[PDB]
Design a protein around this ligand. Structure first.
Ligand SMILES: Cc1cc2nc3c(=O)[nH]c(=O)nc-3n(C[C@H](O)[C@H](O)[C@H](O)COP(=O)(O)OP(=O)(O)OC[C@H]3O[C@@H](n4cnc5c(N)ncnc54)[C@H](O)[C@@H]3O)c2cc1C
Ligand SMILES: Cc1cc2nc3c(=O)[nH]c(=O)nc-3n(C[C@H](O)[C@H](O)[C@H](O)COP(=O)(O)O)c2cc1C
Ligand code: SF4
Ligand code: SF4
Ligand code: F3S
Lengths: 348, 1483
């Protein structure tokens, strides 16, 4: 007779104090301990017809884990205390737990049955704890599929979609090659997402695991002027166009010509590359230590820009947005089947 | 309806006995209902001895020899004459070749004009044939054998020719008259009966009910020898087993006549005719009538500790060679010079008989059949179960059952035979080996396992010791429609008993069950000796690995073993033929055990569906007449559910070895989960599976695994008629469906995918009992759920339309989704069709248990529906009377549909009278043949107070209605309820099933105003998971069959059909209306509107939304509102009206039944298997009327109540003044008091009147259900003897029953009440001056009673009150008694200990002064009101009586009473003390 949903109160892991969060470029959170993870997993009530797994566009906003994670199953396993089985069930469907757990904004938390007037179960944190403990114990090892048929797919783009497709094709038994412009594979996971969210050591470890599988990445190949499409088609049967979406809309307003105005993507890429190269000692990035910083455009990009400016120790930072400030709780035109629009107050 | 006989013991004969038998039949007539017209005879007949005097006086042209040296025949002919004389010549030729001399022929004069129209039209011709006796025939037994040979040869020739004629009887001591005649018509029709020349010894009779309105003269009984009551639920397996043994019967008495008599049974005959044929064959074979009757209808011999060793050995021996024939039955056979009478192994019918100083036994269904002198009556006994009432005319004495049974048992050394000849297969303990395959995942995927299935069906079984429960019954699409590959098992749906028989219980009635299974080959049945019993016998159908290996390794020459590979490559027909070849080769070699193994299966060889393979093998063996020589053991991986197990046993499998499940448990234990040991896990799984099989058996009513084994109790849904005839002959299928090629393709697809499986090492999640994205589609997906909720909360119509579109299209959910409109008609404007206010009056909320739901949710539902103007409903958990008054704000929480379930929890005079309509919960969609359990933890005080039980006591609701043992009893209950509430409409709740048309016709004849057909898709508070998934059929088939049968019979214009179950859209409503619905029930949808999220956790009592949980903490989270329900109903009505505009229909009754507007959609054809269905059965409109116009005239008028009692008692009831009257009551007057009780309750209410305000006297025999629903303040002095169901649903008042004034014998030792008394009563008193019947005080809940002895199963499910038995007690006393007290007097303490069921009762000795004083006062009132000598003597010897009394009280009841008493002594308020005690008890 599970009763955790009412006999337990949701908690959070041990986070580094904010006043010291601004000094070290490292992960700003840690997974649960064993007892805390068990207690949090116990909350989920073996929910029949779960609403944390619908994963479909609802009213213009996503809801539920789109990759169809077996959330009730591995929550029950986490509560029971068998961790290898939970890891196996998680990896059955998901392929990049180490990124999903510590990057995904967790629409599953926002939308599930237990979220009716009560705090939701920490699906994201449980997933992160599972994958982190698995990696620490070293149960994850390269699969090395024995069966192989000579073929060729040439996935283009090193983003998460490209990596997932390459892993699936390699498990199928078809040789693949990943063409990337940037020095290091990963796409957004490397440069776009900040070090804070995704320490690049984990990304590099996963890419090394894929290379051990045999993906055989190739770097510094913009597959445009360098390599022609006709030759690519002749040399490779199919091509999975994970080309990405990096073009950013511009504000057609006078005054946006003077030096100083910069693009969030370019600035983040420069800063992350400089840090990964020489701990931002190369002096080839954009500095704002003694200058004001203003970011236009709310969302994850704005939050990342604010965080990067704060770590660069800008004197003042202000975030601007046209959308009115969100309410502090659910409103009449917002319901739990849909992703909420409540005040969040995330990191940074 | 019933039976009767008026026999003179000493053998003296007169016409008076025949006349009295006819009078008895006339009196018995009243039990039956009305058909098309009252004149029609549903079936009746009379049996006598041969009237030699009349024959010699009348024939005048036959030289009749002496009494015993000739026989008389009775033949029915058609109206034509050419076939008549041809058959006459042929019968004469048969007699001449057999060597007997035909004396002549005679024609019976008949009065055709004295008969109804239909029977006049069908009137057949009658001729009696006289047979001669040759000098060789020394013995009348040989003469009867030759006559039987002649009759069977003639029947064989007739069936070969195809003509239509029947032998009513051909014997030297019995001549039978019967037909479609009322008893008042029989005497006029058969003018022979009017002559004063007949002289007989006995006169058996019988009246049929004719469930269907189209009977034939042949079917109506008395049959050739015996008269039968009730129905047999094993009549398919019965016939299969009998046909199998047919080819192997061999004996010397018949010589070579077995070849002539090869067809021993009538395949087309009904249960009674089949039983008569089999019984006659057995008794002619050379066995005594009593011996063969005992063989056919045995007592409970397993699990019973009240039986003698000789009897136990006797029944153990005979069960090893012949299976039992279960079902409600009251046999009364004859053989010319001996008579007998038996009840089934459970005693489910009444039988009370008289004895007089002139030796006139009067054995009949009820008591007051004929007028008898109370100064001459000697014995008033009851034919208790397992007791043989046997009479021998030549000896002229009632031979005692005990000595008959003893000498039958001792006739042979059965005990020694069993002790010696049994075979021991003791396994070696050192041969253990925990088997593993190393391909567990591959085999599991091949056989269709899922992680959901494992973690939700296997571990819970071990954890809880029982099958896991559930709620929100299955809504997934049928297997035939589901796109995902499904095993053959899903196509087969279980069955259950609705009417003509109760669903018997198992846990409480364990003494009746029998799980003994025999393996091997049966011997010579007719001359059996030691080789019928040199066989292996098992305790459970399931087997363990060690047991299976021991059976396979047994090398005894007589018991050989063979292994047959049930596998195929491409051709299923080739595989089955090859399997048959191996089987027959092994039989020729001499094997006795066959092992169907799915092992050694690789990518090239795939397994046949085990159900199909077993059915094919069983049918082939039965056809070739070798099944009795073998034993089919099955070893299939796909055997893990009780459903699969029960299917295998029912269709032939001797034992199952779930090696795959055992290997899975081994793997889990090795991994670490399920810490329990391997052997303990295996034993627990076996025990749980056996318990589940017993539960499935109890659902139908078959109480013997041996009987169920032959019985085919499944209804294929989606299998072609040709395939069913070929392999599953006898199974019922409506739509045909998929074929052998499609089944093979499905199996091959599954096997190929599973053995490919080259991507992962995990089992895909199941979707049978939960929804997982990408799994099997479900009716209530999250998209539909939240779209419906949003639309309802916003009052927006576009969102609701989107929800309807999503729910209906994009998938195949149900049969009704395969129907589409033609689209070429005349649309009509939305302003020209009937209005939404008219629409919404034809909706219902469905039964909603107050225990399952919360008070807020229940009141919201009731308020919403009452405001809308429909008809709300109240569940079986009663209702607080505080809801019968509207609130100041205008809300009305009263429920318009009061349900009368098996529990009878809240049934009361007030609760029944303050209502608008009444339902009878014969079954629900989810758990038809099962009851329920509400343990102490889940029964809170605020529910117990409403349900009239002690707080914190586990309540039990018996599965069957103990007042419903047949359709006649159903009609009686319907009349009782109508008399209780004359100003209401009676309703019945059925479930779609094969024969549901026949059941509906029978109910309509039983005069039920409204019939409700509920599909299995409906929800439920709690039920076993397999009962959820594999029970019932979709309501579409049931509704179509019921409508067709009703309107063909002509009664469709006398009832009002309804529908419910996943009615989620106006399209579904329109489909139901076209199929023939009139009012609809929405239960699941209103819950979703209120806030339910279909989480499927109601049984857990932990609803997160607080819709189906009693916890106040969760209840505080509720958010529902009646406005949402109102909006939902309005949107449904508006969408329906839009479709009415589309279809151009003007009015409801105008559209109803117009199925011609329905045609199959092209999507069904596009579907790869759904295109093979035959829908003409549903698309078919016979001529007739299709709407309810007639008022369903009841017979409330002319009742003794209205005639005499009320007219002189209106003043008394209205002025609250005392009044006294005396009335003469006969058995025809049924209820006699419920009307006055209802008037009192309506005028005053629960309070009633001062004690002893109305003092009604009565005299003579009373009617059935006498004094039911009597309120407080009334008093019914019944100076006589009554019939069944006395004091049904009592709600106060006194009931004093004393024997007749002219009866001077031990009235305290002669039975004076029927089987069931005080069923479901709540409070009152009673003083019965005699023994009671079987199941006395079944559901007493506060009524104090005093009786001198009771029958069997007495005080079964008490939950309060007290009982004081001044005498002996039957076996299985206090079976499931969860409350109350029973001060049972007794002398032999140890014998009482043994008789009582020790499961849930604690015994004591009276020590409390208050208890002693209460008993003394009760006995003082008993004597003051009865003048009972036993009570007077007990009062005189009180000093010894107090010591000799014995007290019984359940543990939980005692502990709760002690705790609440302690709290009250401490000095706490009643409510807080009750809450504290409940918390302490159920921490
Ligand atoms: C919590 C969270 C935070 C997020 N924060 C950000 C954020 O700060 N900024 C942001 O932009 N998104 C952000 N996103 C969005 C997310 O990063 C992207 O939607 C997604 O990861 C990109 O998927 P992809 O497979 O296209 O990867 P991509 O990186 O878009 O794949 C394209 C890859 O190919 C390379 N490439 C480019 N042009 C070509 C070409 N012509 N030929 C070949 N290769 C080419 C690119 O450099 C890149 O390596 C966030 C998402 C979440 C959930
Ligand atoms: C939670 C729940 C409890 C139910 N309880 C009962 C019950 O106690 N007795 C009964 O006869 N039917 C019961 N039913 C069945 C409904 O009353 C009704 O007969 C029908 O199955 C509802 O069909 P629907 O799912 O389309 O609303 C219950 C249904 C649900 C969902
Ligand atoms: S946090 Fe994990 S489980 Fe939740 S939505 Fe994101 S990926 Fe899915
Ligand atoms: S997160 Fe919500 S929907 Fe998912 S399992 Fe838990 S309670 Fe159920
Ligand atoms: S299924 Fe039952 S447990 Fe609650 S959410 Fe629905 S009422």
């Amino acid at each position: 007779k599970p009763t955790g949903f009412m006999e337990i109160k949701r908690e959070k892991p041990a986070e580094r104090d904010p006043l010291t969060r601004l000094k070290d470029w490292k992960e700003y959170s840690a997974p649960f301990s064993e007892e805390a993870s068990k207690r949090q997993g116990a909350r989920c009530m073996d929910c029949g017809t779960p609403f944390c797994q619908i994963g479909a566009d609802i009213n213009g906003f996503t809801s539920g884990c789109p990759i169809y994670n077996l959330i009730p199953e591995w929550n029950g396993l986490v509560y029971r205390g068998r961790w290898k089985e939970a890891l196996e069930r998680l990896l059955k469907t998901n392929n990049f737990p180490e990124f999903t757990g510590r990057v995904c904004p967790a629409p599953c938390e926002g939308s599930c049955t237990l979220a009716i007037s009560d705090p939701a179960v920490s699906i994201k944190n449980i997933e992160r704890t599972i994958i982190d403990k698995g990696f620490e114990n070293g149960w994850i090892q390269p699969r090395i599929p024995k069966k192989r048929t000579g073929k060729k797919v040439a996935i283009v783009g090193s983003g998460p979609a490209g990596l997932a497709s390459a892993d699936q094709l390699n498990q199928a038994g078809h040789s693949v090659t990943v063409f990337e412009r940037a020095d290091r594979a990963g796409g957004l996971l490397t440069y776009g997402i900040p070090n804070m969210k995704l320490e690049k050591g984990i990304v590099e470890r996963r890419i090394k695991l894929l290379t051990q599988e045999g993906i055989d990445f190739v770097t510094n190949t913009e597959i445009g002027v360098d390599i022609t499409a006709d030759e690519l088609k002749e040399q490779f049967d199919a091509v999975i166009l994970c080309t990405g979406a990096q073009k950013q809309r511009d504000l057609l307003i006078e005054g946006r010509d003077s030096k100083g105005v910069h693009y969030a993507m370019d600035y983040l890429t420069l800063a992350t590359k400089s840090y990964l190269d020489s701990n931002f000692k190369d002096k080839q990035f954009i500095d704002a230590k003694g200058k004001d910083v203003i970011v236009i455009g709310g969302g994850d990009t704005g939050a990342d820009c604010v965080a990067t400016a704060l770590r660069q120790k800008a004197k003042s930072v202000h975030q601007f947005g046209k959308h009115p400030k969100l309410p502090p709780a659910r409103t009449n035109d917002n319901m739990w089947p849909e992703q909420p629009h409540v005040f969040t107050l995330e990191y940074a | 309806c019933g039976i009767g006989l008026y026999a003179h013991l000493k053998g003296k004969q007169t016409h008076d006995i025949v006349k009295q038998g006819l009078k008895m039949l006339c009196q018995l007539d009243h039990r039956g209902g009305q058909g098309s017209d009252p004149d029609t005879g549903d079936g009746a007949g009379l049996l006598v001895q041969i009237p030699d005097a009349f024959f010699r006086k009348e024939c005048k042209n036959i030289n009749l020899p002496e009494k015993e040296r000739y026989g008389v025949g009775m033949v029915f002919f058609s109206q034509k004459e050419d076939e008549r004389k041809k058959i006459e010549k042929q019968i004469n030729a048969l007699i001449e070749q057999e060597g007997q001399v035909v004396l002549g022929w005679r024609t019976v004069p008949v009065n055709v004009g004295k008969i109804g129209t239909v029977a006049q039209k069908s009137c057949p011709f009658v001729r009696q044939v006289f047979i001669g006796a040759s000098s060789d025939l020394k013995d009348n037994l040989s003469f009867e054998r030759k006559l039987y040979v002649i009759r069977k040869q003639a029947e064989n020739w007739g069936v070969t020719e195809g003509l239509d004629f029947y032998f009513a009887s051909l014997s030297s001591q019995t001549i039978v008259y019967k037909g479609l005649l009322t008893p008042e018509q029989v005497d006029a029709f058969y003018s022979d009966l009017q002559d004063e020349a007949f002289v007989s010894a006995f006169a058996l009779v019988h009246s049929r009910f004719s469930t269907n309105t189209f009977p034939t003269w042949e079917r109506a009984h008395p049959n050739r020898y015996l008269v039968h009551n009730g129905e047999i639920n094993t009549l398919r397996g019965n016939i299969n087993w009998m046909r199998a043994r047919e080819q192997q019967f061999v004996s010397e008495s018949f010589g070579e006549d077995l070849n002539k008599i090869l067809p021993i049974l009538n395949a087309d005959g009904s249960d009674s005719s089949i039983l008569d044929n089999a019984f006659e064959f057995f008794v002619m074979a050379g066995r005594k009538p009593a011996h063969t009757a005992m063989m056919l209808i045995p007592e409970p011999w397993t699990e019973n500790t009240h039986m003698s060793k000789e009897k136990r050995a006797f029944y153990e021996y005979h069960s090893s060679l012949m299976e039992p024939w279960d079902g409600p039955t009251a046999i009364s056979f004859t053989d010319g010079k001996q008579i007998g009478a038996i009840l089934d192994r459970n005693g489910l019918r009444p039988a009370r008989y008289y004895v007089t100083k002139d030796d006139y036994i009067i054995f009949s269904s009820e008591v007051g059949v004929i007028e008898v002198e109370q100064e001459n009556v000697l014995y008033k006994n009851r034919l208790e179960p397992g007791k043989m009432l046997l009479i021998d005319l030549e000896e002229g004495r009632i031979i005692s059952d005990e000595e008959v049974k003893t000498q039958i048992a001792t006739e042979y050394p059965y005990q020694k035979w069993l002790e010696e000849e049994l075979v021991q297969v003791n396994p070696d303990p050192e041969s253990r080996e925990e088997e593993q395959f190393s391909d567990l995942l591959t085999r599991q995927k091949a056989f269709g396992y899922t992680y959901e299935d494992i973690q939700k069906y296997l571990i819970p079984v071990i954890k809880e010791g029982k099958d896991p429960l559930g709620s929100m019954g299955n809504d997934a699409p049928l297997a035939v429609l589901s796109d995902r590959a499904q095993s053959l098992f899903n196509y087969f749906k279980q069955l259950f008993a609705q009417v003509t028989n109760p669903p018997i219980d198992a846990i409480r009635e364990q003494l009746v069950t029998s799980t003994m299974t025999w393996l091997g080959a049966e011997g010579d049945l007719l001359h059996p000796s030691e080789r019928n019993v040199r066989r292996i016998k098992l305790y459970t159908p399931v087997l363990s690995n060690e047991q299976f290996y021991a059976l396979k390794t047994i090398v005894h020459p007589d018991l050989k073993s063979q292994k047959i590979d049930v596998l195929f490559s491409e051709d299923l027909e080739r595989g089955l033929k090859d399997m048959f070849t191996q089987a027959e080769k092994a039989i020729s070699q001499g094997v006795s055990l066959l092992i169907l193994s799915d092992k050694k299966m690789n990518e090239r060889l795939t397994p046949i569906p085990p159900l199909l393979a077993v059915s094919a093998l069983h049918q082939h063996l039965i056809r070739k007449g070798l099944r009795t020589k073998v034993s089919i053991i099955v070893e299939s991986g796909e055997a893990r559910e009780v459903h699969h197990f029960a299917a295998l046993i029912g269709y032939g499998a001797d034992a199952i070895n779930p090696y795959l499940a055992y290997a899975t448990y081994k793997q889990e234990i090795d991994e670490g989960r399920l810490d329990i040991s391997y052997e303990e896990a295996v034993s627990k799984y076996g025990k749980s599976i056996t318990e589940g099989v017993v539960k499935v058996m109890s659902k139908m009513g078959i109480s013997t695994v041996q009987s169920y084994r032959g019985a085919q109790i499944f209804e294929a849904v989606g299998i072609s008629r040709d395939v069913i005839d070929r392999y599953f002959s006898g199974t019922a299928s409506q739509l045909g469906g998929i074929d052998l090629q499609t089944i093979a393709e499905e199996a091959q697809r599954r096997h190929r995918e599973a053995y490919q499986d080259d991507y992962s090492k995990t089992l895909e999640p199941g979707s049978d009992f939960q929804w997982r994205n990408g799994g099997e589609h479900h009716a209530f997906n999250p998209k539909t759920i939240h779209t419906l909720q949003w639309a309802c909360r916003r009052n927006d119509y576009n969102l609701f339309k989107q929800y309807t579109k999503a729910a209906d299209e994009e998938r195949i959910g149900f049969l009704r989704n395969l129907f589409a409109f033609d689209g070429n008609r005349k649309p009509l404007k939305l302003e020209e069709v009937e209005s939404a206010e008219s629409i919404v009056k034809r909706f219902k909320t469905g039964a909603m248990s107050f225990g399952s739901l919360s008070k807020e949710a229940h009141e919201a539902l009731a308020i919403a529906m009452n405001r809308l103007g429909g008809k709300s409903n109240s569940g079986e958990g009663g209702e607080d009377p505080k809801r019968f008054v509207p609130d100041e704000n205008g809300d009305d929480r009263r429920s318009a549909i009061k349900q009368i379930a098996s529990g009878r929890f809240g049934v009361k005079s007030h609760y029944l009278v303050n209502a608008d309509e009444l339902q009878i919960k014969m079954a629900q969609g989810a758990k038809p043949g099962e009851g329920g359990q509400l343990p102490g933890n889940k029964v809170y005080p605020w529910v117990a107070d409403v349900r009239g039980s002690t707080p914190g006591v586990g309540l039990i609701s018996p599965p069957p209605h103990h007042d419903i043992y047949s359709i006649e009893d159903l009609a009686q209950l319907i009349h009782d309820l109508k008399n209780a509430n004359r100003d209401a409409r009676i309703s019945v709740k059925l479930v779609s099933k094969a024969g549901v048309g026949t059941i509906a016709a029978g109910v309509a004849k039983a005069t039920a105003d409204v019939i409700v057909i509920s599909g299995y898709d409906g929800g439920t508070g709690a039920s076993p998971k397999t009962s959820i998934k594999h029970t019932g059929l979709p309501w579409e088939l049931g509704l179509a069959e019921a409508h067709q049968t009703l309107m063909l019979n002509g009664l469709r214009d006398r009832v009002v059909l309804e529908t419910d179950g996943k009615l989620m859209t106006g399209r579904d409503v329109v489909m139901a209306a076209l199929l023939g619905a009139e009012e609809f029930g929405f239960a699941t949808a209103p819950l979703v509107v209120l806030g339910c999220v279909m989480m499927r956790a109601c049984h857990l009592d932990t609803c997160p939304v607080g819709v189906a949980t009693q916890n106040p903490e969760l209840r505080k989270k509720f958010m529902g509102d009646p406005d949402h329900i109102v909006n939902y109903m309005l949107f449904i009505a508006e969408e329906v009206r839009e479709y009415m505009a589309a279809l151009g229909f003007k009015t409801f009754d105008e559209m109803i039944g117009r199925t011609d507007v329905l045609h199959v959609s092209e999507r069904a054809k596009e579907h790869w298997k759904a295109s093979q269905l035959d829908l003409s059965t549903l698309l078919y409109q016979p001529e007739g009327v299709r709407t309810f116009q007639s008022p369903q005239n009841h017979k409330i008028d002319q009742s003794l109540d209205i005639t005499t009692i009320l007219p002189a008692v209106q003043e008394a009831i209205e002025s609250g003044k005392e009044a006294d009257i005396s009335i003469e009551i006969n058995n025809t007057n049924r209820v006699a008091g419920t009307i006055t009780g209802s008037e009192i309750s309506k005028r005053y209410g629960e309070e009633g009147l001062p004690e002893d305000t109305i003092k009604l006297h009565f005299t003579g025999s009373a009617g059935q259900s006498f004094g039911a629903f009597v309120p407080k303040g009334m008093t019914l002095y019944l100076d006589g003897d009554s019939n069944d169901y006395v004091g049904k649903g009592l709600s106060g008042g006194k009931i004093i029953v004393k024997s007749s004034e002219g009866f001077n014998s031990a009235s305290d030792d002669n039975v004076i009440i029927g089987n069931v008394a005080f069923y479901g009563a709540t409070s009152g008193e009673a003083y019965i001056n005699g023994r009671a019947g079987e199941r006395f005080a079944v559901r007493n809940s506060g009524v104090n009673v005093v009786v001198e002895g009771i029958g069997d199963h007495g005080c079964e499910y008490m939950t309060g009150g007290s009982v004081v038995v001044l005498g002996d007690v039957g076996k299985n006393f206090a079976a499931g008694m969860s409350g109350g007290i029973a001060y049972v007097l007794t002398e032999d303490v140890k014998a009482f200990k043994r008789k009582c069921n020790l499961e849930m009762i604690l015994f004591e000795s009276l020590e409390d002064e208050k208890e002693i004083q209460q008993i003394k006062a009760m006995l003082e009132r008993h004597t003051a009101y009865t003048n009972s000598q036993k009570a007077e003597d007990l009062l005189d010897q009180w000093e010894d009586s107090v010591k000799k009394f014995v007290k019984v009280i359940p543990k939980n009841y005692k502990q709760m009473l002690a705790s609440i008493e302690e709290q009250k002594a401490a000095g706490l308020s009643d409510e807080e003390a009750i809450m504290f005690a409940f918390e302490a008890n159920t921490k």
